[PDB]
Amino acid sequence: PTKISILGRESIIADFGLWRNYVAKDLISDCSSTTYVLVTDTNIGSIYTPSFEEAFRKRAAEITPSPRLLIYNRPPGEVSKSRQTKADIEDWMLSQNPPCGRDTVVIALGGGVIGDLTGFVASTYMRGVRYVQVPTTLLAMVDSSIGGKTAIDTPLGKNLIGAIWQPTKIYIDLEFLETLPVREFINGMAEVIKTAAISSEEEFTALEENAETILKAVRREVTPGEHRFEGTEEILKARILASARHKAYVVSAGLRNLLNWGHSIGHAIEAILTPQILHGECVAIGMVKEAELARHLGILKGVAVSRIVKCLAAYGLPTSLKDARIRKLTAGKHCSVDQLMFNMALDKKIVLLSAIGTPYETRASVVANEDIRVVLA
Ligand SMILES: NC(=O)c1ccc[n+]([C@@H]2O[C@H](COP(=O)([O-])OP(=O)(O)OC[C@H]3O[C@@H](n4cnc5c(N)ncnc54)[C@H](O)[C@@H]3O)[C@@H](O)[C@H]2O)c1
Numbered sequence: 001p002t003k004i005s006i007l008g009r010e011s012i013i014a015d016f017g018l019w020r021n022y023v024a025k026d027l028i029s030d031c032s033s034t035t036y037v038l039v040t041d042t043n044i045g046s047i048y049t050p051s052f053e054e055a056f057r058k059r060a061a062e063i064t065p066s067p068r069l070l071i072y073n074r075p076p077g078e079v080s081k082s083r084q085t086k087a088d089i090e091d092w093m094l095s096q097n098p099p100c101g102r103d104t105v106v107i108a109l110g111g112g113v114i115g116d117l118t119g120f121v122a123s124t125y126m127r128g129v130r131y132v133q134v135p136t137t138l139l140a141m142v143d144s145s146i147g148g149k150t151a152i153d154t155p156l157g158k159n160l161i162g163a164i165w166q167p168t169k170i171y172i173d174l175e176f177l178e179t180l181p182v183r184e185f186i187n188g189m190a191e192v193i194k195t196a197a198i199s200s201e202e203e204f205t206a207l208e209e210n211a212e213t214i215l216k217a218v219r220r221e222v223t224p225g226e227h228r229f230e231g232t233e234e235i236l237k238a239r240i241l242a243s244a245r246h247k248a249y250v251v252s253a254g255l256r257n258l259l260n261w262g263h264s265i266g267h268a269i270e271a272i273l274t275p276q277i278l279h280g281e282c283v284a285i286g287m288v289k290e291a292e293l294a295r296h297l298g299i300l301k302g303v304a305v306s307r308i309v310k311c312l313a314a315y316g317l318p319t320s321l322k323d324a325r326i327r328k329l330t331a332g333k334h335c336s337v338d339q340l341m342f343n344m345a346l347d348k349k350i351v352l353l354s355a356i357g358t359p360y361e362t363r364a365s366v367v368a369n370e371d372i373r374v375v376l377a
């Protein structure tokens with residue numbers, strides 16, 4: 001079982017099959033409690049909750065008095081990352097027999113929506129209770145589940161109310177990616193490529209070379225019982241864990257600014273195109289625009305911009321606002337240069353790359369609005 005440290009503790013545990021034969025046992029022995037609360041959505045729970053209920057019972061059977069496992073299922077979608085849902089979960093926890101107390105260990109089984117929501121619930125339940133992250137999406141495995149950043153959204157913005165609350169454990173089971181929708185897997189690759197581009201030209205090269213194999217496995221038709229990533233586990237785990245390790249490294253150390261490469265323009269685009277277009281899709285276009293911005297300022301070589309554009313496309317991500325899929329889903333929406341500048345103002349410090357794997361500076365750089373408007377043209 002591969003382990004990765006974060007903030008001094010060895011909380012990240014990664015491998016294929018953890019959910020089926022490692023987590024329940026580990027929670028009972030390492031996160032001892034009388035009460036375990038599992039929060040997930042109906043899409044994810046319908047697939048993974050049954051096996052775990054059994055793994056838990058078997059693991060708890062030995063302990064005495066045996067602990068309980070309580071399950072809360074939220075509707076899928078970001079609509080659930082709200083004040084009302086947080087309050088409903090808390091009320092439900094307080095309605096148990098007996099009510100969930102300070103020893104409760106909350107299990108966040110899901111993507112960034114469930115992870116953000118669940119972590120925030122854990123942070124304030126009776127002023128704070130332990131929780132673990134069990135990321136089921138690619139973006140969650142390498143980004144959202146690491147760092148302790150929790151929150152909910154309000155009608156005025158994303159993640160505006162929340163808290164920094166570190167999970168006791170982060171179980172990364174790559175088998176969850178076997179059922180993750182193709183579009184979501186691709187969406188998550190935006191963060192993986194971003195991380196390689198700002199830290200390792202060698203890792204970026206590995207991604208370029210593994211693109212066809214991985215995407216093939218993702219788009220593959222699986223037989224009722226076989227594993228989707230059959231003979232490419234080592235490759236997948238390597239590429240995914242490289243991004244999670246970087247995120248962990250950054251969180252454990254201005255350097256975190258680099259993690260926002262592609263997000264200055266990316267977030268501006270998303271503010272306009274969401275919810276039709278996903279975060280990673282917006283950031284992919286953002287990485288291309290920000291790479292072109294650096295080239296405009298003569299900081300990044302054109303050859304480098306081409307590699308970024310092709311690597312993003314090789315994983316199925318859009319590289320321009322003129323992308324066919326984007327326009328089809330955004331019928332009626334348009335990202336005017338002014339609308340994009342307006343959004344970037346509410347964020348100008350953009351992360352600039354001098355070479356793949358090499359940032360211009362160990363932080364975001366200042367850019368004149370004049371130059372930004374030219375790359376958005
Ligand atoms: N905490 C942070 O620092 C941070 C960083 C980045 C993004 N985010 C947050 O992440 C959220 C987006 O999360 P996301 O992209 O993971 O999407 P998501 O959590 O909305 O999940 C996407 C969809 O996939 C389904 N799904 C998830 N895992 C599955 C699996 N293994 N098999 C089958 N279906 C599965 C879900 O039911 C859902 O419908 C946003 O709300 C954003 O604000 C937070």
Ligand SMILES: [Zn+2]
Binds near residue numbers: 191263279283
């Ligand atoms: Zn992002």
